[PDB]
Structures are given as C-alpha cells and as structure tokens.
Design a protein around this ligand. Structure first.
Ligand SMILES: *[C@@H]1O[C@H](CO)[C@@H](O[C@@H]2O[C@H](CO)[C@@H](O[C@@H]3O[C@H](CO[C@H]4O[C@H](CO)[C@@H](O)[C@H](O)[C@@H]4O)[C@@H](O)[C@H](O[C@H]4O[C@H](CO)[C@@H](O)[C@H](O)[C@@H]4O[C@H]4O[C@H](CO)[C@@H](O)[C@H](O)[C@@H]4O[C@H]4O[C@H](CO)[C@@H](O)[C@H](O)[C@@H]4O)[C@@H]3O)[C@H](O)[C@H]2NC(C)=O)[C@H](O)[C@H]1NC(C)=O
Ligand SMILES: *[C@@H]1O[C@H](CO)[C@@H](O[C@@H]2O[C@H](CO)[C@@H](O[C@@H]3O[C@H](CO[C@H]4O[C@H](CO)[C@@H](O)[C@H](O)[C@@H]4O)[C@@H](O)[C@H](O[C@H]4O[C@H](CO)[C@@H](O)[C@H](O)[C@@H]4O[C@H]4O[C@H](CO)[C@@H](O)[C@H](O)[C@@H]4O[C@H]4O[C@H](CO)[C@@H](O)[C@H](O)[C@@H]4O)[C@@H]3O)[C@H](O)[C@H]2NC(C)=O)[C@H](O)[C@H]1NC(C)=O
Ligand SMILES: *[C@@H]1O[C@H](CO)[C@@H](O[C@@H]2O[C@H](CO)[C@@H](O[C@@H]3O[C@H](CO[C@H]4O[C@H](CO)[C@@H](O)[C@H](O)[C@@H]4O)[C@@H](O)[C@H](O[C@H]4O[C@H](CO)[C@@H](O)[C@H](O)[C@@H]4O[C@H]4O[C@H](CO)[C@@H](O)[C@H](O)[C@@H]4O[C@H]4O[C@H](CO)[C@@H](O)[C@H](O)[C@@H]4O)[C@@H]3O)[C@H](O)[C@H]2NC(C)=O)[C@H](O)[C@H]1NC(C)=O
Ligand SMILES: *[C@@H]1O[C@H](CO)[C@@H](O[C@@H]2O[C@H](CO)[C@@H](O[C@@H]3O[C@H](CO[C@H]4O[C@H](CO)[C@@H](O)[C@H](O)[C@@H]4O)[C@@H](O)[C@H](O[C@H]4O[C@H](CO)[C@@H](O)[C@H](O)[C@@H]4O[C@H]4O[C@H](CO)[C@@H](O)[C@H](O)[C@@H]4O[C@H]4O[C@H](CO)[C@@H](O)[C@H](O)[C@@H]4O)[C@@H]3O)[C@H](O)[C@H]2NC(C)=O)[C@H](O)[C@H]1NC(C)=O
Ligand SMILES: *[C@@H]1O[C@H](CO)[C@@H](O)[C@H](O)[C@H]1NC(C)=O
Ligand SMILES: *[C@@H]1O[C@H](CO)[C@@H](O)[C@H](O)[C@H]1NC(C)=O
Ligand SMILES: *[C@@H]1O[C@H](CO)[C@@H](O)[C@H](O)[C@H]1NC(C)=O
Ligand SMILES: *[C@@H]1O[C@H](CO)[C@@H](O)[C@H](O)[C@H]1NC(C)=O
Ligand SMILES: *[C@@H]1O[C@H](CO)[C@@H](O)[C@H](O)[C@H]1NC(C)=O
Ligand SMILES: *[C@@H]1O[C@H](CO)[C@@H](O)[C@H](O)[C@H]1NC(C)=O
Ligand SMILES: *[C@@H]1O[C@H](CO)[C@@H](O)[C@H](O)[C@H]1NC(C)=O
Ligand SMILES: *[C@@H]1O[C@H](CO)[C@@H](O)[C@H](O)[C@H]1NC(C)=O
Ligand SMILES: [Ca+2]
Ligand SMILES: [Ca+2]
Ligand SMILES: [Ca+2]
Ligand SMILES: [Ca+2]
Lengths: 388, 388, 388, 388
C-alpha cells in the first residue's frame, strides 16, 4: 500500500445516479437505530462507508428526548456499511466527540473528533485507529471542523478548523497532517470572511473545499489547497446562484471576494464541484428552510459573477426535508477520472417536526454519470405520525 | 482468480433435495426482519447468498403498511447469508432500486439496480462494489430486469432488460457486460413476443433463460444466449405442460413459436432446466393463483409440442402460497457437472392475505440429486393471525 | 491444511472445569434468541462453536407455540460462537433439517441434515458448505443420526444412522464418508440391540461412540469404530452404573452383551469416556426424569460388569432440568493428549414446564482437568415465571 | 509475531484526552445490552477492546433483577469493540466466571476466569482461546483476580490472585504464566498487608500494579514486578493523597509501609501511574461514596510521604456515579513511549439507585496527552427515571 495521489481530473458530469440510501428513520421506527446527525460518506481502498455523529441513543429510546442539541458527552463519530442504517449492532465508533472529519490516505484512515465544553474543546487525531496528536482550543469558542471527509495527497491530509464566533470574525486554520502528525498549519488567507464546515474534494494534486460563511455570506466561501506546497487561498463562489440557506433571492450578479449579503448569522453545510464548464452546485430548493435539494450546472461559477444554470437535477422535492450536504469521491475506483459524489442529510424531527422530541436524519447519496439520466426525488420516507 | 467458464453440463436430475430456507416471516413476527420481495439466490466462488428487494422497513414496523407496491425510493437489492432471514443487522445493500440482477464472473460480482419513476428509470451497473456504467430508459415505461441472477462466461455476463408495455409489444434488449462495461447489446430476436423476468443458467458455453410472457403466453418464452459470439435466439417451451400463472388447463399440444393463449396481461416469474430428457419445469400447482409449486420432468419440453410429465416432485402444497421462482447454480462446486438449483418465493400478506397491511415473502431453495429422494412440502410456515 | 489424524490418547481426567455456557433462555427472555433443541459443540482447527437444531422462531415469538414437536419444515442445523446465545443475527445455518451431525476433518467441515416426512426422510451431506451426497430413507421410519459431532481420521469420518422403529428392531448403518462422498457403509454389528443418537470421540486411531438403546436397554450401547479399516463392533457398557434415563435403580452387576431391562421404549442422548481406569460416565441424577447431571469415574466400566464409582462430580443439581448430553474434543489443541469435553442440554418449557407453550434449551459445557477442582452446579438459570 | 517486550518508558502526562465511551446504559434503555460490571480495556496488536463481566441478561430483561450480586453461574468475561455497548449480538465470550483478567503477549491472548462457590472456586487459564491450565482455590474463600488487564514481557505474563478473607489477612500469590502454563508462583512479599484487584501497567521491563487494601488501608498497596527475574516487592503509595474509597480526609503525611487507617473492610478498584515527577493518581472525588473521579499529578507519590497535587483533571463530577477504575496501555502503538491510559466504570442502579432492581455500568476511558488540554466531565448519561 502506497499513499494515494490525486492524479486524475473530474469526470464529465452530465447527471447524477443513485449511490446510497439508508432509510434510517423509516427502519428505526421499529429497530435499534442510533439517533444521528451531521452524516457523510468516506471511502477506503476496499470499502465505502457511511459516517455520522451518534447521539448515543436509539430513536425509539427515551434518551432521544433532547437530541436537537449538538454537543453532549454522548456523541461519537460512527461508521457503518453503505446504505445500511446506523444500528447499535453494526456501527463502529471511530472516536468520541461532537465535531469530526475522517479520510483514508491510501495506507490507513485518519479520524478527528473534537469534544469538550464550549470554552475548552480539544481535537484528538486518530491514525490507524490509535490516537496520535491532540490540539487544544485556540479561541475558547467551540473548536470545530468539517463534518465531512478530508482529502489526502501523498500522505498529506489538510483539514480546516474554526474556533471563535459563529456570528462575527473567527480564527480558522488549515492543519496539514501526515500519519496523524502535524506537518504544518496556517491561519486562513484569501478573501473568505468566515469559514465553517468545509466540504472537500481533490483532483490533479489540488484540494477544493466549499464551505459555509455563517456570519454574512449567502454565497459560499471556497478554499483551494495545494497539498504539496501546503499553501492555500480562499474566495467566494462568484456566481449569482446563491447556495447557502437561508438566503435572499438569486441576484443577477454575485460577489467573488466578499459575502453576498441579506442573511446574517445562519447557514447550512453544502458543497460544489468547481471544474470550469463542468461545474455543479448543490443547494436547498427553499430559500427559507432546509427543504428540497437540487444540483445546478453553473459553468464557471467560481470565476464568473454573472453565471446562471445551464442544466439541473432535483434530488429532494421542496416538500421534503433536507439538511447538510457534502462531497466525497472514491479515489480508489479504476478509470481515467474521479467520479464526483455527494450526500444529503435528510433531517427529521425537531425543530421543524416538533410533535416528536427527537432530531435525527437519514442519508441519500449520489455520484455523477456521463449519461443524461432521468431524475427521481429521494425523500427520507418516514411518516412522523408513526412515532406519535 | 480467473473468469469462470461454463465448461460443464447439467447433472442428471432424479429429484430435488432441500438447499436453503430462511423462515423469514415466521422469525420476523418477533425480530428485526426487513420486508422484501422478488428474492433469489446467487453464488460467489466462496459463498452462496440470498438476494431480494428490501422495502426499507421491518415487517412489524408501521412503514410495512403499503409494501404491496413494487416501486418506491425505499427499495434496495440486499444480500444476506444463506438460510438466515433478511435482518436489518445482517443484510448487505448491493445497490438502490426496485428491479435487479446480480452475478459473479469468477473474479468479482456485478450487480444491477434500476430506480426512478415509471417514465424516467435508469439502470446502474455496479462491479466490484463500485458503480461503473449507467443505462437510461429507452421506452420510458418501467425499465426492468430479471429479478434473479445473471450468468457469466469468460467475463461476459449477458443480462435481459425490458422497457415498454406489460400488456402489449415492449422493447427488450440483451446487454453483454464485461467488468461492468457494455461490450454490446442487441434487441430481442427469435419468436418470443414478450419478455419479462428471465431466469437464467449456463452450461457448456451456453446460457438458457426461461422468461415470462406477460402479454399473451401461458407457455414460457426461452432465450438461448451464446456468450462467446454474443448472439441469441428465442422461442417458447413447446410442451403442452404450461408453466405460467394464471394459465388455462394443460392442452395436449403446445406452441413452439407463439404465445399459448387463454390468459392475457398477467403472469409470474418462473424457470426451467431444458436439457433433453433431463428436462424439468417448475410451476405453481394452481392455474388461478400463486399457490403450490411442483417440478415436472418433461423430456424434451423445449422442442416437443406433445411432451408430458414422466416424473414429478411437490415443493409446496396447493394449500400454501408460492410466488416467483428462478434458477441459480453453484458454478464453483467441485465435480464433473453443474447441479441445477432453484428458489421459490413464498409470498405472504397482500393481496391474498389482506388482514395484514403488508406484503412480504420467505424463501425455499432446492438443488438436484442423482438419487430418487422422498419429497416433503416446504411452506412459509407463518400464522398470519399472529400479526393481527 | 492436512487431514487430522487421531494420534493422541485421552488426558487423565481428575475433574471437569467450566468450558462454555450460553444462558440462552435467560437472555432470550428479552432478545432475539432462536428456539432450539438437540444442541452440541464442535471444533474447527481455529474455532469451537455451539451447534443445535433451530425451530425457526424466537422464544418470545408467537411461533414458539408448539416447539415441543421434533420435526418440522422450520428446523435447521445452526452454529454460533461459543457461549453466545443462538440469536437470529449471529447464527449461521449449516443445513436444513430436524436431525444432524457435523465434524471438521482438518481441512473442512462435513455437515449432515435429515429432513422430510416420517416415511420419506433424506440425508443431505454438505462438505465445504456445499451439498455433495444424498441418502434416502431405507426403512421409511424417521431416518435419523447422532445429534452431536462426528469424528474424522485421515479424511474418513464415520457417522451412525438409524432408520426404523424406536420401540423395536431398527436398521442401523455406519457410513464412512470422505470429502462428503460415501467410501463405504455397513449394517450394525456386535451385540447392541438398538442404536440411537451416538456420542462419539476419537483417540489413537479409534473412534468410540456411546449411544441410546431406546427399545430395552438402561445401560448404553457402545460402538467402537476403526476408521482406517472402516470396521466396527458394538456392545454395552458392562458397568452396573446405569446411564440412560429413565432407568431402574443401579444393580450390582450390569450386562455386557444385552440390554439391561426394566425400562422400555424411552431414553436420553448421553455419552461416556471409556479409557481403562480413566473412565468417566455421564448421567442424569434422577432415574425418572431429565433432571440433574453427574460425572462418575467408573474404572473399566466398558469391560467390568461389577464396576462402581471411585470419584464423582455434580454438573447440574437434581432440582434443575437437564436433557441431552454428548461428547466433543478440540482435536487441534496443542499438547500431548486430547482433553475430553462434553455438553449438557438444559431443557426448559414443555412438557415439564407447561405454563409456557414452548420448549427450548440452553447449554453448559465442560472439559477435563488433570487437577482435582472444586465443583459448582450449572443450571439453566431462567425463571419460567418471567415468560408468563 | 514475536512476544512483546516492555522496552519503552511512559510518555509525559500533561493531561488526559477522551479515548472511549460506550454509553451502554443510555443505549440499553432501548436495545439488547447485557448487564455488566467490573469492566476494563485491553489491547491486541491490531485492536483495542472493552472487557467486562456479563451477568447473562439484558438490562431491560426481567433477569436483571438481582444483578447487584457479584457471583453467579450466569457470568462470563465478555469482550466487544471499543466504545460500542456490550450487546447480546456483538459481545464475544472469553471464558465463564465472575472474576477475570486478560492480556495479549504479542503473539496471542491469555484470559483467566474464576468460577465456582465461595469455598471451592477455580481459575481456568485460556491461551489462544483454548483452556490450558487450571488452579484450584488454596484458601477456600473466594479465589479472585485483578478485574483488569495483565501485562506481559517476553512471553511472561504475571497475574495477582487473592484467596482468603476480605476483612483480615488473606493469601495472595503472583503467578508467572507463559503460553498459558505456570512458570512459577510466589506468595506476596513486601509490606502490603492486603491485596485485591490490582491494576497493572508495564514500562522498561518492569510491571507496576496499584491495588486495593480492603482490610485497613486507604492508601493503595503497590506491587512492583520484575517479569524477567520473576520476582516482586510491595509497599504502599507514600503520598498523603489517599486514593481508596471510602477514605478519611487527606492528611499531610502518608504511610509507605503500612495501611493508612480510618477506614476498614471496604474499598474500590483503582490505579495510578508511578513515574517520578510524571506521577498521576486516580481517585473518586467523594470520600464517602463512589462518585466523581479526578486525576491528580502527585510528583513522586510512591516514595514521598509528604507529596501533594501540582496539577489535576476532573473526569467525572462529584454529582455523578463512578466505580472501579484501572490501567491499560496500547503496547503496540508506534512511538518512542507508552501512552498511559485508564478506564472508569460508571455504575448505575443498585445500591445507590434502588428504584431499579438492577445494577449495571457503562465505561469512559482516557489516555494521556503531552499537551495541556481543556477538561470536560464524562458521566454515564442515563436517566434512571426512564427505566421506571
Ligand atoms: C426525465 O429526466 C430528465 C433528467 O432529469 C428531466 O430533464 C431535466 O428537467 C429539469 C427540470 O425540467 C431540468 O432542470 C432545469 O434546467 C434548467 C436549465 O435548462 C434551461 O436553461 C438553459 C437557458 O440558456 C437552456 O440551455 C436549457 O436547454 C434549458 O432551457 C434550470 O434553469 C432549472 O433550474 C432553475 O429552475 C428550477 C425551477 O424548476 C429552480 O428550482 C432552480 O433553482 C433554477 O431556477 C432558479 O434559479 C435561477 C438562477 O438564479 C433563476 O433564474 C430562477 O428564476 C430560479 O430562481 C428562483 O427559485 C430559486 C430556487 O428556489 C431561488 O433560489 C431564487 O431566489 C428564485 O426564487 C432546472 O434545473 C434539467 O436540466 C433537465 N435535464 C436534461 C438532461 O434535460 C426530464 O424532465 C424528465 N422527463 C420527464 C418525462 O419527466
Ligand atoms: C416418497 O417420495 C417419492 C419421491 O417424491 C414419492 O414418489 C413420487 O410421487 C409423486 C406423486 O405421486 C410422483 O409425481 C407424479 O409423477 C407423475 C408421472 O409419473 C407417472 O407417469 C408416467 C406415464 O407414462 C409413468 O412413467 C410413471 O411411472 C407414473 O405413472 C406425474 O404425471 C404427476 O404429475 C401430474 O399429476 C399431479 C397431480 O398429482 C399434478 O399436480 C401435475 O401437474 C401433473 O398432472 C397435471 O398435468 C398433466 C400434464 O399436462 C395432466 O396430464 C394432468 O391431468 C394434470 O393436469 C391438471 O392439473 C394441472 C396442475 O394443477 C393443471 O395445470 C392442468 O390444467 C389440469 O387441471 C406427478 O408429478 C413422482 O414421480 C414420484 N417420484 C418417484 C421417484 O417415484 C412417493 O409417493 C413418496 N412415498 C410416500 C410413501 O409418500
Ligand atoms: C469441593 O470440591 C470437591 C470436588 O468436586 C468436592 O469433592 C467431591 O465430592 C463429591 C460429592 O461429595 C464426590 O462425589 C462422590 O464420589 C463418590 C465416590 O467416592 C467414594 O467412593 C470410594 C469407595 O470405594 C472411595 O474411593 C472414595 O474416597 C469415596 O468414599 C461417589 O460414590 C458418589 O457418587 C454416588 O453418590 C451420589 C450421591 O451423592 C450419587 O448421586 C451418585 O450417582 C453415586 O451414588 C449412586 O450410584 C452408586 C453406584 O451404582 C450407588 O452405590 C449409590 O447407592 C447411588 O445409587 C442411588 O442413586 C443413583 C443416582 O441417583 C441412582 O441411579 C441409583 O439407582 C440409586 O438410587 C459421588 O460422585 C467427589 O468424588 C469428590 N471429589 C474429590 C476430588 O474429592 C468437595 O466435596 C467440595 N468441597 C466442599 C467444601 O464442598
Ligand atoms: C480548561 O481546561 C483546563 C485543563 O483542565 C482547566 O485547568 C485546570 O483546572 C483544574 C481545576 O481548576 C486544575 O486542577 C487543580 O489543580 C490543583 C493544583 O494546582 C495548584 O497547585 C500548585 C500549588 O503549589 C500550583 O503549582 C498550581 O499552579 C495550582 O495553584 C489541585 O490542587 C486541585 O486538586 C485539589 O482540589 C480539588 C478541588 O477542586 C480537589 O477535588 C482535589 O482532590 C484536590 O484537593 C484535595 O486534596 C488536596 C491534597 O490532599 C487537599 O489539599 C485539598 O484540601 C483537597 O482535599 C479535600 O477534598 C478531597 C477530594 O474531595 C478529599 O479527599 C480531602 O480529604 C479533602 O476533603 C485540582 O486538581 C488543573 O490543574 C488545571 N490544569 C491546568 C493545565 O491548568 C481550566 O480551568 C479550564 N478552563 C476553563 C476556562 O474552564
Ligand atoms: C504517489 O507519489 C509519491 C511521490 O513520488 C510516490 O512515492 C507514491 O508511491 C505514489 N503513490 C501511488 C499509489 O502511486
Ligand atoms: C422530554 O423532555 C421534556 C423536558 O425536557 C419533557 O417536558 C417531556 O415530557 C419529554 N417528552 C416525552 C414525550 O417524554
Ligand atoms: C476460461 O477460458 C479463458 C479463455 O481462454 C481463459 O483465459 C481463462 O483463464 C479460463 N478460466 C478458468 C477459471 O479456467
Ligand atoms: C395503513 O394505511 C391505510 C391507508 O393507506 C389506513 O387506512 C390504515 O389505517 C393503515 N393500517 C394500519 C393497521 O395502520
Ligand atoms: C495423517 O496421516 C496421513 C496418512 O499417512 C498423512 O498423509 C497426513 O498428512 C497426516 N496429517 C497430519 C495433520 O499430520
Ligand atoms: C398455542 O396453541 C394452542 C393450540 O395449538 C392454543 O390453545 C393456545 O391458545 C396457544 N397458546 C398461546 C399462549 O397463545
Ligand atoms: C523481545 O526480546 C526477546 C528476548 O531476547 C526476543 O527474542 C524477542 O524477539 C523480542 N520481541 C520483539 C517484538 O522485539
Ligand atoms: C425482583 O425480585 C424481588 C425479590 O427478589 C421482588 O420483590 C420484586 O417484585 C422484583 N422486582 C420487580 C420489579 O419485578
Ligand atoms: Ca450564510
Ligand atoms: Ca403470461
Ligand atoms: Ca433406554
Ligand atoms: Ca480500603
């Protein structure tokens, strides 16, 4: 086993095919399914798995009462087989905490969990299923990371952390890890004004992250990382197709180097693939809530402040709940190119569905096709009434 | 690992011995068993497993209400260990969809799932547990496949799809896949007038499929595939022993090149082994419903329009529910010959048992013996009343 | 991997230490535990597992109603990890049927299940988890086998079957199997008048089975097998320490070549280790029912019609339910000698505990020590009242 | 695989990071979780697992009634994946008994379980998952061992046993095992007056155990073992920071060679790391009950009868239940040094929470960091009221 290198480009995305779906909430109505949130997907050379933050209780368990809360001593990063539900019996604990990332470098998996109270959180970096490095809070205000997979290049796996305010300037850092050890770190540069929950992918020795500007921006900050030189910049998606939520209506001209205003102190984890004409953005259909999800082909979104969709695909109807979304690819597939993939978290329960005392989610996940495939919509599928 | 070649003939079938039985519905009365339908069996070089389409809910789960329906975003092709039930905790998801096939080529497994709405379905071809190829609907009318295992020869694995009407001419195609990639495809030829849900087996470098003529035929269409030349023909079982359901009474003379009439717009997945004198047909005992199942030795059924049974075996009594049946063999057993096997889906619940709101099934499966073994009958075994 | 040869003798048995206990019924009060009976233990070169006949339902399942019955289409030989309970999720199905044996020959496992109606049963011999040979009933009266593990020597694994009456002369046969195939078989010889449910072990190229004379004998028939010459004789344990159940009181002088009378048409599966002075017999403590279990050191029991205990150990108190017992050894342990082991089936429910509608069991298992260890008693441990 | 040698020293402990947490009781409110107690953690070269004594019943099972009791035929040493709960379906039974230890020697795992009545207990030593040696009670008064992992050096794995009174002089012995066989044993030497439940670790070819003086001492006896010479001494932690429970208030000067008095016939399993200035002690926060847990850096605690804390960390608040605590390290991590770790048993139910009829626990576990990390508190997290 050698370290993986990002030596391919993206395949052409002409549409998106179904990849994985767990139906966790449907199934959890009558079986031992952990309450989760902040899910993602990550591949090993021999396996792709579902990841999420457990709440340390089953949906039907009485301890699910209160699981709207993000941070407790009862959370862990868990992983489980693709399209199975996160059950008590089939889930593997990666590490303990309430904020996480994980990736495989071609030889083994790095996993990072942050735990602790708001003013005294710490990150523990696991490599090869053993803790190797720890990082203490630097700003004493909820140290936090991506909540989706990191990408590695020749052993170097960059990871974006934020510590500080969610509603004002914070301190963001890029850690460059190898075999669990800190090669290097830098404070955020470029023109992104606030960074949270970066969704990352890698192609051609470059790692692109689309993040969440929780403070001011309804366009998304991007961080472009060079994992060999261990340097980066940042900016925003220029496109007027705004991809945060909530958000104002799409203008005609976006902003490249500043937050697009109209919505403050809020947002959602999201992602894009930024590849010239082969550029697709994800967003919730609603501008007001986390419902619906669509992919839009927006040629040159990153660099073109007037760019609009030339093609699209519904993933989740606007009458269905969505949530977080992020990027992963199977870097170990055979072929000339990396096939873009993504997941959408389908949040159920609180605060939108408050007849139940819990909040959980299921997952849907899709990869790109070079065909023009017909679309379906992919809702969670559970009847809340069944839990009353 | 080399690609498997079909270099053996069928063993002599003098009877059928018990191979596998899951008792899923009995067990699912009180444990976390997925609702399923359209089951089958498929072998790897080192393992044989049960396959079926999950409905993404347990039997006792409230979400089982409505599982009579065939097509939802909640279905997946699942596999699980032989004679165990399809449980939430022991089931492995092969791919997402509501129509499927799967086979191992000697090196790895190809799995195919079709998903999407009626007029915009698509097939995703997985190979080595990664998606490789996609095929869009060509007739915009429920793209669909075999619902039992494909067979491979020197890497080439043919698969039969139908897109179009279930009650009139449709467009059927034979895809020749290798390592997940389309070598070639052809439109259906021969004299079969309508093709659905082919049950396939392979011997001596030839692949025989017995299918379902849903439109007109109560005899079964056969497709004979040559996986080296990648060509095929089709016809019907000539025999007057009619093997679809529902069906008219057995005549005295069958038809070789046309549907045997008397029953329209309906049928059931079934199978046969067509091997000269060593020819066995499966059918439901009832002509009106999916109840009972018998094997009949009908020498030269494929070519002899006057052929009648010379031997038989009851699998399921006429007072017990059956359903789909299909063919598989363990191509990787040691020995001079391939031992024919088959499964029968034992459907419970709706529409026949409508005091419950669900439809599910269990499985029984048998292989051939060169002995003359005594028969038993093999019912599902669950008391519906227990679910009231 | 070579075939195992029985090249060691028995270790000296100075007592018995705890080996395994599943607590199945206790645990099954509140978890998904299969109803079973006729358990045993069998070792592979790398693992020892629990075996039993599933009834194809959980204890708490409604389908457990009626599980006093021995023979149904819902039974299977299952295996599961040592001292775990037979759960729906952790049990592996070896083959389908209601009478079984299984052993490993050093290279792979042979497993045999008999299924079918009383007058038309058949045995299917699985080898390396594929069916290889079938044997039809010869006497059309419940073909049946050992219900505990067979022993192999240089690939040859003898197995004892009985077909015919349980209350009069029957036809017993010794099949000599290699790689699943019949090398040879013989009708029973020696002076044993009726043979059922043989418990076998092997030492020094010889295989000794202690069986159940259901017709007349309260002493136990023994079959001594020579697996190289593939020949055998039979007799009874000479000792006046009678080891069947029910049974008359111990006389002073036993019988070597005839059933010891006083009890007809009944009995229980049991076992012994017959090794000169190093001879231990198992029996229920009660003479009337399957309660209690003790080991007695009875020097030269096989050959000495006046032999009495010189040492003993309580396994189960007379106020606790027992049941079947049988022999196994780990032939693949390191050391100069084979360490004798045995299990006792702890039957709960019907017919003795008829406030519940079910019959099931748990297992306790012990191996020998060259120490003189203190004894405990090892009851099932479940409160029947909890199931009311 | 070679035998592991203890060739490293301890890393500097500047704090403690979260390692593992199972949330067993929270989760067990609504899933098939075994009742346990006396947990620990132990590493293999490729895996770290949770260990504990099962009570052979689920928490919600009716058989959990009475699980305050320590010793029954229903207990076993179980192991399961790190931070998962001890479920019926994912737990592996190591051996049967109600007192245990276990360790890996670099080649395979030794596991020891003691079972039997109070006056006739016996230890069975398993090696490579087979029983190898047995040891009978020597004092006929509850033969018992460490209840946490042993440490090995070049194949030699010492284990501390006590047989005799818990409230007066007892007979303690150090067994030196290799490949399951007794190399040697010695009666306890040094100045420790009573030894129970030793928590052991190894560094630089020396094995240090901190134990429980149940008779008189509120300071903890230490046993220092030399696994090459197979010799040992014992003493007490000199420090006035008293680490048993219950205990008197901390004096100003401790005792090195005698029990520190004021509390009789009681205590709790605990541990320390004794490494010059790099010395950390664990204790319950309360002096009266098993609530709270803190680590205190007490430079030279072992040798300095006036030593006081210079640094500390809260693990469990004084308003949360604790229990047993013990030591383990991953001897197979890469790096220049061994990273100290420990677990705390979080006992719930009886006798402190007597509205439920059961006693069980969950686990939290931590390892050391060379950073100064912020602390959190790590409670069990279950609401007892949910079980009413
Ligand atoms: C079978 O399968 C196929 C494959 O899926 C199906 O075919 C697909 O059909 C899709 C829907 O019909 C279609 O998706 C659309 O593509 C449009 C672009 O194509 C057109 O544009 C260019 C123009 O130069 C042409 O090249 C091209 O040929 C087409 O004419 C997109 O523009 C669509 O997205 C916009 O509309 C949808 C509403 O349906 C919005 O939800 C979406 O967000 C986009 O519109 C918003 O944003 C833009 C940009 O800022 C604004 O201009 C616009 O006013 C909207 O703004 C409001 O709403 C948003 C979102 O809520 C809010 O944020 C904002 O503030 C405003 O309130 C759409 O993506 C697929 O391309 C097509 N694929 C293919 C291969 O054909 C087929 O139908 C199926 N067949 C059957 C039989 O069912
Ligand atoms: C212990 O075990 C052994 C092994 O299992 C048991 O022995 C088996 O017993 C079976 C049942 O007795 C027997 O199965 C039958 O074999 C018949 C053929 O054998 C005979 O025919 C030739 C004649 O030249 C001889 O060579 C031979 O020796 C025999 O005489 C089959 O013909 C039987 O099938 C037909 O009958 C059954 C009814 O029982 C139907 O269900 C079945 O579909 C067949 O009949 C229908 O179809 C034919 C053909 O078109 C029509 O002619 C006929 O009228 C029927 O049509 C109606 O019903 C059908 C179906 O519902 C419907 O579609 C149609 O429209 C009409 O309504 C049967 O298969 C095994 O061969 C035999 N095996 C061996 C090795 O002996 C043994 O009994 C057991 N012993 C004990 C002690 O129990
Ligand atoms: C700590 O641990 C140790 C280790 O376990 C405990 O020590 C063990 O203690 C056992 C019980 O005390 C003891 O077991 C007994 O051994 C006897 C043989 O030893 C004696 O005999 C010879 C005589 O020449 C001497 O060499 C020797 O030193 C002893 O004196 C057995 O004979 C005992 O078995 C018989 O008794 C029990 C009743 O307790 C029966 O249940 C059993 O079936 C045997 O008796 C029946 O059968 C015989 C033979 O036919 C008849 O003679 C007799 O009348 C009985 O028949 C009736 O009942 C049977 C069965 O129900 C029925 O079928 C029949 O028809 C009649 O109704 C017994 O096995 C262990 O040997 C001993 N081990 C060691 C190493 O010491 C120790 O106590 C524990 N310590 C503490 C502190 O608890
Ligand atoms: C973010 O994270 C960081 C990292 O966790 C947090 O910083 C940590 O804060 C901890 C608590 O504030 C602190 O822990 C304490 O350290 C003390 C030692 O440091 C001081 O001492 C020396 C003095 O020469 C200086 O070098 C040093 O700079 C400090 O001044 C300990 O002494 C503390 O332990 C004692 O106090 C606690 C009460 O809080 C007791 O529970 C504990 O048992 C100790 O006190 C008992 O025992 C001693 C010794 O016998 C007696 O002297 C004393 O009277 C107590 O005895 C009573 O109570 C006990 C226990 O119940 C009973 O048995 C006895 O009989 C009596 O009844 C304490 O461990 C960490 O060191 C510090 N770490 C770092 C790196 O800074 C930070 O606060 C967090 N930040 C935020 C923003 O929250
Ligand atoms: C990636 O490139 C590095 C740097 O030269 C090389 O050493 C490594 O083996 C490559 N990895 C693979 C999987 O090709
Ligand atoms: C959950 O907790 C809230 C208070 O935190 C309480 O009011 C409510 O009763 C609980 N919900 C249920 C259904 O138990
Ligand atoms: C099947 O035949 C092909 C074509 O010659 C050959 O290359 C292959 O190795 C054969 N496979 C096996 C398993 O023998
Ligand atoms: C299932 O759904 C139907 C409507 O779709 C409803 O009438 C019925 O009440 C449900 N059945 C049960 C038993 O809940
Ligand atoms: C057992 O003896 C046979 C017969 O000579 C031999 O071929 C075989 O290898 C032996 N098996 C082992 C495990 O030693
Ligand atoms: C079990 O079945 C019997 C009849 O076979 C019936 O009388 C009884 O009601 C059933 N027992 C229970 C508790 O359901
Ligand atoms: C430990 O040292 C022993 C004694 O010399 C040696 O034989 C063994 O191989 C060493 N083990 C390892 C893992 O280095
Ligand atoms: C548990 O057992 C005790 C007696 O041992 C009994 O009084 C009590 O009823 C039981 N508790 C429950 C809740 O069943
Ligand atoms: Ca925002
Ligand atoms: Ca038809
Ligand atoms: Ca008898
Ligand atoms: Ca004490």
């Amino acid at each position: 086993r050698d370290f993986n290198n990002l030596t391919k480009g993206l395949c052409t995305i002409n549409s998106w095919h179904i990849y994985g779906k767990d139906n966790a909430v449907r199934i959890g109505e009558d079986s031992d399914v952990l309450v989760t949130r902040e899910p993602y997907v990550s591949c090993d050379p021999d396996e792709c798995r579902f990841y999420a933050l457990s709440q340390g209780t089953t949906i039907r368990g009485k301890h699910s009462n209160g699981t709207i809360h993000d941070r407790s001593q009862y959370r862990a990063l868990i992983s489980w087989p693709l399209s199975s539900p996160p059950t008590v019996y089939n889930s593997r604990v990666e590490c303990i905490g309430w904020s996480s990332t994980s990736c495989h470098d071609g030889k083994t998996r790095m996993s990072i969990c942050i735990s602790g109270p708001n003013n005294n959180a710490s990150a523990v970096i696991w490599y090869n299923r053993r803790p190797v490095t720890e990082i203490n809070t630097w700003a004493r205000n909820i140290l936090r990371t991506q909540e989706s997979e990191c990408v590695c290049h020749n052993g170097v796996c960059p990871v974006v952390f934020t510590d500080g305010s969610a509603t004002g300037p914070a301190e963001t850092r890029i850690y460059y890890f190898k075999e669990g050890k800190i090669l290097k770190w830098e404070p955020l540069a470029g023109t992104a004004k606030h960074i949270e929950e970066c969704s990352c992918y890698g192609e051609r020795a470059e790692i692109t992250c689309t993040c969440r500007d929780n403070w001011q921006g309804s366009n998304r900050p991007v961080i472009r990382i060079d994992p060999v030189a261990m340097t980066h910049t940042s900016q925003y998606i220029c496109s007027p197709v705004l991809t945060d939520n909530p958000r104002p209506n799409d203008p005609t001209v976006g902003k490249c180097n500043d937050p697009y205003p109209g919505n403050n102190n809020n947002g959602v984890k999201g992602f894009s693939y930024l590849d010239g004409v082969n550029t697709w953005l994800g967003r919730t259909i609603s501008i007001a809530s986390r419902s619906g999800y669509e992919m839009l082909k927006v040629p040159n979104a990153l660099t073109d402040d007037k760019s609009k969709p030339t093609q699209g695909q519904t993933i989740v109807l606007n009458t269905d709940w969505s949530g977080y979304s992020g990027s992963f690819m199977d870097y170990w597939a055979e072929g000339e190119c990396y096939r873009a993939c993504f997941y959408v978290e389908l949040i159920r329960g609180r605060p939108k569905e408050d007849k139940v005392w819990w909040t959980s989610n299921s997952i849907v996940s899709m990869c790109s096709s070079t065909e023009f495939l017909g679309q379906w919509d992919w809702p969670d599928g559970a009847k809340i009434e069944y839990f009353l």
